[model samples]
Target: KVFGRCELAAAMKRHGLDNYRGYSLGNWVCAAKFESNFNTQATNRNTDGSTDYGILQINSRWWCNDGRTPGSRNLCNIPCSALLSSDITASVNCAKKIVSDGNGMNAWVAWRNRCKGTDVQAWIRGCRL
Candidate 1:
């Protein structure tokens, strides 16, 4: 009924962290486990009749327009389908576009550094399983 650790790993792989760097997979797994247990069919309510769906809690309404690239709200669209294609493959692409000019580690590390609340350049040096 819900995505598991493996699913999240697959998703992250697809999201563009092919190497699964810097507690990203660990942190995201914990968050998703807490959020909705990785349920793709998960949903939440809205005022009218709209709904939030999927493992990432993507809202169909927001997705309709926001999911479209060039008009995306979350940095850029990257499309829900891309993510759905295969958890591992999709997220890799998504992560690429989520940053400046889709430049892989440069973009992801930058974001993670901010999220880690420290100088991630040095921080990543010590990251290990």
Candidate 2:
């Protein structure tokens, strides 16, 4: 629970993620809301046996290594445990790379399931951006 809505938005903006991969700040903030509710320590094991990590819930299969999961791409070269922290610097950096990989926010299932095509502006409403 490192950030409230406005705090997270400000941090993301400071990290140069006000906009990235053509996605808006709203989308990022909204996606984070559903992904982990701003909990950096959040982890969920998927039915497919993959684990999602951090506020962004980056998957173990492609983004990080938890050591329990075999054949993890570890694209971010970070341990899954590293993502579960109050400091979101590494998580945000990895997210940027994930978006740059061309999946955009589509890599996040929550974004696809909920944030996509919705009016995400409310996610950042009242934020002093």
Candidate 3:
């Protein structure tokens, strides 16, 4: 399922992403826009045998285990498949853990390139609390 921008904003907010890890809705929403276009089934495989998954486009390299990543630590301790659910709850939860590290929101390359040092307010411009 592909979520509308504001709809995704509302859903992400409900999952406590508003200000989690000092990153706001704009940061997350902006990254999600580019990473997966809010598609619940998006997948991108890396040449290193890792894969990016779900709405957040979380990488199996460090976040989850796809049972195929060459040297995965599976830091989130959840199967990479869990991040593919349409509900998005597990994806958000794993993202929280990933951001909890010192890397902050920089854990996501899309966030680093598209959301960093920018006014991403438009990503969630008209979103209501």
Candidate 4:
């Protein structure tokens, strides 16, 4: 499922990500936008032969076990394929895991490229809570 901006914001906020680790919902939204354009079923290959999955592009190498990525740690303790579905819960949890790894939002290069140091207020402006 592709999420509308407001819908995605509400979901993430309800899941307790608003201001998580000192980053705003806007930052999260911006990351999602760049990561997968809000498409829940997105997937892409990594340069290391692993894969990026779901809306936040949770990686298979360290976050989820894809059965394909060699030496996967499965830090999130989830199947990478679990992220490639309409259920954003798995995706959201994995995203939280990545951010909580003490790297801040830099876990995603897309965040640094497009979301970091940029005001993402517009991403949540009309969410209406």
Candidate 5:
């Protein structure tokens, strides 16, 4: 599922992510842009042999099971494929779990490397939330 910026913002707002878990919606938007470009079906193979899934790019090694990846914690308790849906409810729930575990947005390399300390508000610009 490919989401336009405004549509993504709307969904984020509906899901109560404007200020979720001590992070701003702008932060999530910025991270998502770099992570998946708003494509829910996005998946990437990482250097550590793990795969990242969906718009938030949650990892298969810890959050969800990709079947091929052994020793997954599956803390989210859902199939990795579930994150590929257009509806982001499962993804958001899993993200909350991750943040609650004290990782914050540190789990996303894109957020740490690209979005951190940047003017992430641009990600939500021109959108009404």
Candidate 6:
């Protein structure tokens, strides 16, 4: 049994999600820096008592709502409305599905907004996680 971001990355890549898996080391680091500082087990119980979990700071319960089967939970987690996988590529792909209704890097742009910088590549280099 393995755990942690690196292992998660391997699993995601095995599933053909390269961005969050292969290409996501930087982006995942960036998101984790802002979201949970790479805390895979962190959870946020909102003011209303809602719950958010994982490195991407996913709210498991939110994503588990009606019509969304537990199988729909991203990256093999509980369930929630938050970003699917903290894995960079999976999340990036998930984000793509959101904006364009297809696999693309739309959320990658929004996710990158957290890091402090203008150039996307610079942001990746500048981010520390």
Judged by lDDT relative to the true structure, which candidate is superior, 5 or 6?
5
Runs in model 2 with CA error above 4 Å?
A: none
Off by over 4 Å in 5: none
Task: Give me candidate 3's TM-score against the actual structure.
Answer: 0.94
Best by TM-score: 4
Best by lDDT: 4
Candidate 3, 1-129: lDDT as tens digits = 989999999999999998887788888899899889889999998888889999999999888988888878888889988989889999999888888888898888988988899998878877775
Q: Per-residue lDDT for 49 in model 2?
A: 73
Candidate 3 collision pairs: none
Candidate 5 TM-score, true structure as reference: 0.94
* TM-score-best of 2 and 6: 2
Predicted structure 6: lDDT = 0.44
Angstrom error of the Cα, residue 71, model 4: value is 1.2
lDDT of 1 by residue, 47-66 (tens): 64444444444443434232
Better of 1 and 2 by lDDT: 2
Clashes of each: 13, 0, 0, 0, 0, 10
**Candidate 5: deviation at residue 90, Å?**
1.1
Tell how far residue 73 is off in model 1, in angstroms: 8.1
The TM-score, computed over Cα atoms with residue i paired to residue i, of candidate 1 is: 0.43
- Reference-based lDDT, residue 110, model 4: 95
| lDDT tens digits by residue: candidate 6, 1-129 | 213555544444455544642344445445554566555555566555555545555443334332333333443332353343444443434432433434333333335567434333442443233
How many clashes (backbone atoms < 3 Å, residues ≥3 apart in a chain or on different chains) does model 1 have? 13
Q: Per-residue alpha-carbon lDDT of model 5 for 4-83, expressed as tens digits? A: 99899889878888788878889988888899999999999988778999999999999998887777788899999999
- Please give the distance, in angstroms, between residue 124's alpha carbon in candidate 4 and its true position after superposition: 0.4
Q: In candidate 6, which residue pairs get closer than 3 Å at backbone N, Cα or C atoms, i.e. clash?
A: 19-89, 20-88, 20-89, 52-59, 53-58, 60-79, 62-81, 63-80, 63-81, 64-80
TM-score for each candidate, following the candidate numbering: 0.43, 0.93, 0.94, 0.96, 0.94, 0.43
Candidate 4 structure, TM-score to reference: 0.96
